[PDB]
Subunit: 75 residues, 3 copies
């Protein structure tokens, strides 16, 4: 059972130990979210970098065609 | 020390205060994960948008070359 | 009120029920972070796949122009 307290409204032994254990899990969770954000952010950066390099090649190709079009239209 | 309860199996004072403090941290964690997901999702959207615009330029370049190839193959 | 314990330093009833409920929330949080990481990772994969296919088309366009340039420079 979990998240139950309707049929039980009285204190029990190991109350301090229970809270101490729960406190540790709470902090561990915050660390998980932080690390997860860093990992996801890293992947995003790599994706943007790839798109950047890709644009560089396309720009060069455009110039090559621009020269051919000029002469193709000439005379 | 943290997450300890083997050498301690008895209740202590401030039991209600301890739980109240732990409850606040639990909720704060859920909010962190939610916000983190939104931030990561935003970055993903921007990446897809960039790739979209990039494809638009490439398509235009393809048409320019298609015209030159036709005449290059003619006669 | 939440995260309060300065004006209260004494145990109360339902101490076991309070900890049991808090424990459930702690575990639920860990699951949220895990699922969130998977969702974000999926989106990243799709973005990389799109960039990959885009590069394939650009490469083909480059070859088409390379042939036209050769003849354009000839004679």
């Amino acid at each position: 059972g979990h998240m139950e307290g309707k049929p039980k409204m009285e204190p029990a032994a190991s109350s301090q130990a229970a809270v101490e254990e729960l406190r540790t899990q709470v902090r561990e969770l915050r660390s998980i979210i932080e690390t997860m954000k860093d990992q996801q952010k890293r992947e995003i950066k790599q994706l943007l970098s790839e798109l950047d390099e890709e644009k560089k090649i396309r720009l060069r190709l455009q110039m090559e065609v621009n020269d051919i079009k000029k002469a193709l239209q000439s005379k």
